[PDB]
Amino acid sequence: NDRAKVILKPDKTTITEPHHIWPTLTDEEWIKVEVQLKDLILADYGKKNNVNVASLTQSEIRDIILGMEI
Amino acid sequence: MDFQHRPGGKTGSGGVASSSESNRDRRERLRQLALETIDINKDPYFMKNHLG
Amino acid sequence: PLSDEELDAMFPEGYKVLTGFHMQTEDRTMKSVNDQPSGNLPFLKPDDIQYFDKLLVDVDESTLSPEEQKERKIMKLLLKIKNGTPPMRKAALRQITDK
Amino acid sequence: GLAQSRQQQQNVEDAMKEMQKPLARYIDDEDLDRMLREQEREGDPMANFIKKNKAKENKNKKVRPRYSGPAPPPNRFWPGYRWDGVDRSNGFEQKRFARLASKKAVEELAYKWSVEDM
Amino acid sequence: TRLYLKAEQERQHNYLKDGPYITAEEAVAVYTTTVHWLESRRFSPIPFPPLSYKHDTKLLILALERLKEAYSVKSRLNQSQREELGLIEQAYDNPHEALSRIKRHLLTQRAFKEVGIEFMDLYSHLVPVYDVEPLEKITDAYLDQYLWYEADKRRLFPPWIKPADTEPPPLLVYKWCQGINNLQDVWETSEGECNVMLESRFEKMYEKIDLTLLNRLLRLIVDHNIADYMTAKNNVVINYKDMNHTNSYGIIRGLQFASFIVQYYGLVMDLLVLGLHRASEMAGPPQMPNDFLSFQDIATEAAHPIRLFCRYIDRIHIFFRFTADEARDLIQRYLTEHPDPNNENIVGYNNKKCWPRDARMRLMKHDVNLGRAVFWDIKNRLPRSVTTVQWENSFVSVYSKDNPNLLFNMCGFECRILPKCRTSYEEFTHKDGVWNLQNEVTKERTAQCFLRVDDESMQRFHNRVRQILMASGSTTFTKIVNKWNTALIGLMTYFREAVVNTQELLDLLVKCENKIQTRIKIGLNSKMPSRFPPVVFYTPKELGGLGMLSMGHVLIPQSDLRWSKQTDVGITHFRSGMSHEEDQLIPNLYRYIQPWESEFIDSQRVWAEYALKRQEAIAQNRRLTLEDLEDSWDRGIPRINTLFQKDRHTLAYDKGWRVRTDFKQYQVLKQNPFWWTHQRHDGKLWNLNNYRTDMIQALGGVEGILEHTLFKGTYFPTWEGLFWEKASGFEESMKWKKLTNAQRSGLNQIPNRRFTLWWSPTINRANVYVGFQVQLDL
Amino acid sequence: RRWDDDVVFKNCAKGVDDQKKDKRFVNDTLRSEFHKKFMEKYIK
Amino acid sequence: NPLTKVKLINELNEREVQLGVADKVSWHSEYKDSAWIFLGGLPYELTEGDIICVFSQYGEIVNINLVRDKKTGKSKGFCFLCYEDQRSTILAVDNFNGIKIKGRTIRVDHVSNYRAPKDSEE
Amino acid sequence: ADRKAREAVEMRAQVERKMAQKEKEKHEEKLREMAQKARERVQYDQRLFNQSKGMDSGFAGGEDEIYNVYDQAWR
Amino acid sequence: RLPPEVNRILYIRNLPYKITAEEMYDIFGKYGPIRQIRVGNTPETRGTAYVVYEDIFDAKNACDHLSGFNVCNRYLVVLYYNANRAFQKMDTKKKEEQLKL
Amino acid sequence: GGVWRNTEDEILKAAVMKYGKNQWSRIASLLHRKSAKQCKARWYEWLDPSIKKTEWSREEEEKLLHLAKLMPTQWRTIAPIIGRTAAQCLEHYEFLLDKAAQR
RNA sequence: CGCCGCC
Numbered sequence A: 001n002d003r004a005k006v007i008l009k010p011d012k013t014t015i016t017e018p019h020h021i022w023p024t025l026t027d028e029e030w031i032k033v034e035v036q037l038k039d040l041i042l043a044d045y046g047k048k049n050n051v052n053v054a055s056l057t058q059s060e061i062r063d064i065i066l067g068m069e070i
Numbered sequence B: 001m002d003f004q005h006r007p008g009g010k011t012g013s014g015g016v017a018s019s020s021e022s023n024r025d026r027r028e029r030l031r032q033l034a035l036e037t038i039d040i041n042k043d044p045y046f047m048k049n050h051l052g
Numbered sequence C: 001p002l003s004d005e006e007l008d009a010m011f012p013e014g015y016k017v018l019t020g021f022h023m024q025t026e027d028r029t030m031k032s033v034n035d036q037p038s039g040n041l042p043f044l045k046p047d048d049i050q051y052f053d054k055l056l057v058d059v060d061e062s063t064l065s066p067e068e069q070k071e072r073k074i075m076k077l078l079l080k081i082k083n084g085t086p087p088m089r090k091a092a093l094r095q096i097t098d099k
Numbered sequence D: 001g002l003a004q005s006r007q008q009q010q011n012v013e014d015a016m017k018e019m020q021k022p023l024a025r026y027i028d029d030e031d032l033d034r035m036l037r038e039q040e041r042e043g044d045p046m047a048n049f050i051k052k053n054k055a056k057e058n059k060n061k062k063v064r065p066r067y068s069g070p071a072p073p074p075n076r077f078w079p080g081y082r083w084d085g086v087d088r089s090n091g092f093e094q095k096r097f098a099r100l101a102s103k104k105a106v107e108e109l110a111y112k113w114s115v116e117d118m
Numbered sequence E: 001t002r003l004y005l006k007a008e009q010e011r012q013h014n015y016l017k018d019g020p021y022i023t024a025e026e027a028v029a030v031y032t033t034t035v036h037w038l039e040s041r042r043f044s045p046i047p048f049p050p051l052s053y054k055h056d057t058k059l060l061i062l063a064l065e066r067l068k069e070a071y072s073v074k075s076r077l078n079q080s081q082r083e084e085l086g087l088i089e090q091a092y093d094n095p096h097e098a099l100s101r102i103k104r105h106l107l108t109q110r111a112f113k114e115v116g117i118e119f120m121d122l123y124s125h126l127v128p129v130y131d132v133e134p135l136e137k138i139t140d141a142y143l144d145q146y147l148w149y150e151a152d153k154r155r156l157f158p159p160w161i162k163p164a165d166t167e168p169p170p171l172l173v174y175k176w177c178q179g180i181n182n183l184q185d186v187w188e189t190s191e192g193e194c195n196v197m198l199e200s201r202f203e204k205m206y207e208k209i210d211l212t213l214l215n216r217l218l219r220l221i222v223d224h225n226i227a228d229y230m231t232a233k234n235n236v237v238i239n240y241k242d243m244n245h246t247n248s249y250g251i252i253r254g255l256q257f258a259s260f261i262v263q264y265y266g267l268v269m270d271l272l273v274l275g276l277h278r279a280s281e282m283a284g285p286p287q288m289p290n291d292f293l294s295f296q297d298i299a300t301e302a303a304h305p306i307r308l309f310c311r312y313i314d315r316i317h318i319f320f321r322f323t324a325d326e327a328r329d330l331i332q333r334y335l336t337e338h339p340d341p342n343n344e345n346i347v348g349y350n351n352k353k354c355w356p357r358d359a360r361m362r363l364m365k366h367d368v369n370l371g372r373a374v375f376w377d378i379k380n381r382l383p384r385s386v387t388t389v390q391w392e393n394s395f396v397s398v399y400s401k402d403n404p405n406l407l408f409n410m411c412g413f414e415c416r417i418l419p420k421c422r423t424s425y426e427e428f429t430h431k432d433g434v435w436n437l438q439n440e441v442t443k444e445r446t447a448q449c450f451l452r453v454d455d456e457s458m459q460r461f462h463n464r465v466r467q468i469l470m471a472s473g474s475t476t477f478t479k480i481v482n483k484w485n486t487a488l489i490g491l492m493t494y495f496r497e498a499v500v501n502t503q504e505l506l507d508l509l510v511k512c513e514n515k516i517q518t519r520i521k522i523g524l525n526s527k528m529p530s531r532f533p534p535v536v537f538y539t540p541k542e543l544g545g546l547g548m549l550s551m552g553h554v555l556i557p558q559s560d561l562r563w564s565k566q567t568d569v570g571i572t573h574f575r576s577g578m579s580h581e582e583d584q585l586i587p588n589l590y591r592y593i594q595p596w597e598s599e600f601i602d603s604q605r606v607w608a609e610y611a612l613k614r615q616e617a618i619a620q621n622r623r624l625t626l627e628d629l630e631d632s633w634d635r636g637i638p639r640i641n642t643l644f645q646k647d648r649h650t651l652a653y654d655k656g657w658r659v660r661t662d663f664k665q666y667q668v669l670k671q672n673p674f675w676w677t678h679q680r681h682d683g684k685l686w687n688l689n690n691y692r693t694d695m696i697q698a699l700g701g702v703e704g705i706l707e708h709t710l711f712k713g714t715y716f717p718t719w720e721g722l723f724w725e726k727a728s729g730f731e732e733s734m735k736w737k738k739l740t741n742a743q744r745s746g747l748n749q750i751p752n753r754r755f756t757l758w759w760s761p762t763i764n765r766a767n768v769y770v771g772f773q774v775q776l777d778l
Numbered sequence F: 001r002r003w004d005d006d007v008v009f010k011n012c013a014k015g016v017d018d019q020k021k022d023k024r025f026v027n028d029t030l031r032s033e034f035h036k037k038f039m040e041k042y043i044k
Numbered sequence G: 001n002p003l004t005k006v007k008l009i010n011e012l013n014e015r016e017v018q019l020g021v022a023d024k025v026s027w028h029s030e031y032k033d034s035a036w037i038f039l040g041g042l043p044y045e046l047t048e049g050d051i052i053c054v055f056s057q058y059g060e061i062v063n064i065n066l067v068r069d070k071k072t073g074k075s076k077g078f079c080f081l082c083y084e085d086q087r088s089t090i091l092a093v094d095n096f097n098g099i100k101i102k103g104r105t106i107r108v109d110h111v112s113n114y115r116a117p118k119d120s121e122e
Numbered sequence H: 001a002d003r004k005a006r007e008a009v010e011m012r013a014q015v016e017r018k019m020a021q022k023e024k025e026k027h028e029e030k031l032r033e034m035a036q037k038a039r040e041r042v043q044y045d046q047r048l049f050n051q052s053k054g055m056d057s058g059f060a061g062g063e064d065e066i067y068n069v070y071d072q073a074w075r
Numbered sequence I: 001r002l003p004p005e006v007n008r009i010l011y012i013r014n015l016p017y018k019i020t021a022e023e024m025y026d027i028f029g030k031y032g033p034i035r036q037i038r039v040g041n042t043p044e045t046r047g048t049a050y051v052v053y054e055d056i057f058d059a060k061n062a063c064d065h066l067s068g069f070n071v072c073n074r075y076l077v078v079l080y081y082n083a084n085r086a087f088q089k090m091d092t093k094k095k096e097e098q099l100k101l
Numbered sequence J: 001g002g003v004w005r006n007t008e009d010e011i012l013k014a015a016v017m018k019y020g021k022n023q024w025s026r027i028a029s030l031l032h033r034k035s036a037k038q039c040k041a042r043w044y045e046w047l048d049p050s051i052k053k054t055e056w057s058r059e060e061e062e063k064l065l066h067l068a069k070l071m072p073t074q075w076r077t078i079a080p081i082i083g084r085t086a087a088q089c090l091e092h093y094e095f096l097l098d099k100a101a102q103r
Numbered sequence K: 001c002g003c004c005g006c007c
Ligand SMILES: [Mg+2]
Pocket: B008, B009, B010
């Protein structure tokens, strides 16, 4: 919750309009935010199971990033 | 489509030839030209030999 | 820094030491001097007019003429090789190798 | 010797944005309605009504005095230019800035070129 | 073309046997007047360009760009234009070889070869098209890029020689209308003082220029060795299918430097018209020259009634303000020679029913006699041998106590001024193409300049889209929607405010847009209401579809037809425009185009702030980083991002454009819809970029994705990484094949049928008529 | 007077040099005045 | 040989700007975690303060290290610099490599270990 | 007319220059003997530049077939 | 600043034949001190000269702002001479130390 | 370039002898470098059998030296009047005679 | 106050 909370506000000025629930940021920073969120999830897996991150195939990274039972 | 005012062409045309056949026809055409000009000039010293 | 002895050791011979207003022009004394030499030969670039400077004037080969213009007809040849069309290249190049 | 300082800065701003703040900040937020009320926002006639002149205090990162006011060249990493940085270089920051601006221009031409007969 | 060319060789033949049409005294007078003007200007004449000229390659590059621009499509001809661009790229790869050839051609060659003539069928209009052989075209394009730079550096041309490098609507208003209300007490009318504008053309100015007088005139200002060049190119054998005739009398305006000749001869024609004392009062002392309509020292303004003067290329606009006794003198000096009262049902607004009858010129006998009298007085002091000022194509309009309302057509689109002091209630001045004028010496608004588009401009637009309908048989669907687009952006980014008021043009746009809608539908043999929805047209090409900029769905207004021609009435009864009412609400094009008076008020403040922060950053020692972006970096009429571009140092020498661009209608045949700007010198004057996004959201983002075959595009799951054709429609030198006839000029069927494949669910929907259907075999 | 005495051509003194009323009829069709007005209205 | 290494470290940056290598992997990502840079080929007239004056353009150098000799010498020709920030070392190895001060041309490279009192290239 | 212009122009040139030597040189003494004690006493940033090359028109020739609109891309 | 531009020399082409002695001294001492000039003798080289200074910046003054300058009525072109040759390598000079320094 | 050597001049003479006057594409169809524009340009500029390409007279020179003063440029207007008519043969005369009136 | 529908 903690570091993903601080990722989704990448600036000091990253307002959300009241009738929306996720932040309002451009698509360039949407793909930037998505890259650092998937790096968060992969780092948490590599710290949880003590596994080297770059050893994984992309099907394996797919199965972790959607949370497949591995 | 303008079927009336499109630049026409006929079926089974075979198309316009490449550069080699075109300038070979140019050389044969120019041969016929010079032959008929010396024929009109009635030149008795023009000879064409065994190899063109 | 130089002296005159090194100075005439440096230079070739054939040389001796020793608002505003509107009016008009007139018809000139035909300021139409040659800047590129007298033939078809090639174009000369502005840097090549020291090396091929002797071609911008016509010799009219007598009274400036030992055999030396035969030994600077090679100037014409180097110009034809260096800056010419490839027929002119191989013509001048065969000519200079044959002589 | 100062990247660690900025790591401390980003961790303390990380702590304040994490442990107490909710996930979304709205337009009110009680912090950005301090920053709108504290912007420069050039074109204020009352600027010299309150300021005397653009003077100099001990305005530096460390208490040691900062560099004076000539123009340090722009150099892609905003520096602690101090103690006589008078513009000697092999000329590379200017080179790479011109290079990337040329890249950003030729992509603008490449779009136009690509999209013509569509 | 047969008829023009044989009438032209009859008049070239009758130039020779009937002598020069200009007398000896009648030409010596012009020559003496020009040497007096030029020595009062201290105009140092142009030297012949040295071979070691400094700013010399920088002009050959401009000439080659201005010539290489004419080749962007590449179905180019057998030799003639392939050898033209071969000459251009040989001039590129060795600039000094070509730059010596130009000097060799330009001192010593004065017997040139054929130029060929064609005619643009502009439908009530034909313009000649002269093509010159390209080895001459390089030399004279260098010559005009040199002469224009070299005569704007020395300021040959006074401020009134237009188009200068301002723009054409600042020429039209914010120098001009601002100029005609900033005169000293323009409307006073309590001592009979009356304003009058004259608007005319120097008629047949292009033909009536004898090359003998031209050669003697333009070797006052140029080196003589290229004055002889400029009058030796002007007579060469014009050509057609059979009809070689030489030239001797008129100039041929397909020459590259013809803009310089036409405007220098227009300079000497202006100082025949103005006299020479008023012209020196207008152009100011040479040590401190004047701006376009500013003077020195308004006592100088007060004398000599012709207050201001603007000559566009062959078309003069004069504003003279008379006190009443001087107008009395001029009317009775006109009436010594012309009896017969009420000969005055002719002047100006009698048939020109563009304005209402109260807004038109009233034909009171004093005002009509004054207007015709001052036309009589400007018709002479301009001899018939050099030009003439015909009455019928000219137009004169007068303000007095009987006429509240000063009307004139300028620089494309026609306007009128109604001052505030002579309206009962304030005419609204805050609605539309209405922009108000203000007396800057007292900061208050004073007049109202109501705008409309000219009649001949919408005639030129309607014939424009008429020929795109006529060439609809030879191009694809996407090309004619592309062509409809470029025609519309040509009309509407120029006539910005004035397209709102001109009701007769808003009827025309609804009429023409639907006609190309229908022209595409009959190519599918459809014409059906719901077999071809307006999703197909108004969807941008980046998704696919044709992508066309609407102005028809606009709800064209009306008013009471009885009282319409009488009086400005107001507004009632919106009439539905295009026939689409299902609440789609396709966006207008006009709302993405920033209006003119807003654009000029942005220009004033942006260049004021830019000079302000230049002297700020010199007052400090900082550097301008991105404090040139609060103005969006692209406000201002020369568009701040124009200074900071890759070719600032050479486009400082592309001087005297905007008149060269207009004279390229007598060159390459593509009628240029953007004759008035180009992007490199005054920026991109419009950014219609969210028209595409607002069009998507006017139709949906999965808009045509319900109609386009996306679901069997494939399993393309995403639609957002979708991308269209890219592959070699340019096709540089294709693989340079032989191309019989129909594969050379015929229309390319394959994009035309992949568009039809793409919308196959909605062009082939099963239930519009539910009768006969035919299944393909197999 | 007193307004334009610096201009060169102080008078052309004549309009058409007599007057303009002809209604004449050349039938050589390139020289007829109908073809003159046609070929000055449309081409320019 | 003594200053063809100048040419080699310059050809590094010229080949990166040729190939277009992003700054995440543009060779300075190996000389992270080190604010130290090896100077090379200084003239012997250069004190500590003059070197701080020329190389402080990208940040005030925290830790300098001239190779002053033991007794008989005064300067050998190197120097090590430790700035505030590592990106100052990136800027300095790009910008101050191959400049020349009073004759001799100097060179800059990263260090990545420590102040080595004498190992490097005389 | 040319010869009866040129001479006239050149004539005025001489007399203008003659007044030069009568005016300015005269003022030279008025500038020399000053009788009160005669001799008894912008950096523009490089990141602005070059963001658009060109020298063409952009409104290419007058060719109305080629999708000039929308300066920048869609997706 | 500018090493690779040979100076102390200036090649002069398209120079008139009426140059007796003085006008090259005029134009080339106008810009600074002169070393000397070379005046041709062949009717080619007659009409084409050299000028050598004691200063570099004066040669820069000449070649930067006399390019295509028109004179007595034939405009001249300026270049920089290329020193490449000699005829005699000088020998048996003493040039001893002699305690001058 | 348009160099126009002899082996194409004589073929052009033969072609104009065969085909005609206003028919130039059909005789540019046999020259391998030339277009019809260049064929018209030479056959009226150099190869026309009416061109009196030598024999400078004395009547035409006293004619042109105060015919090229009437209209000072324009050697295509005064070329049919002189009738030397190659329009550069006139320019050859005029520059040669203003060399010989200068020397 | 509501054109339009194609062999
Ligand atoms: Mg057929």
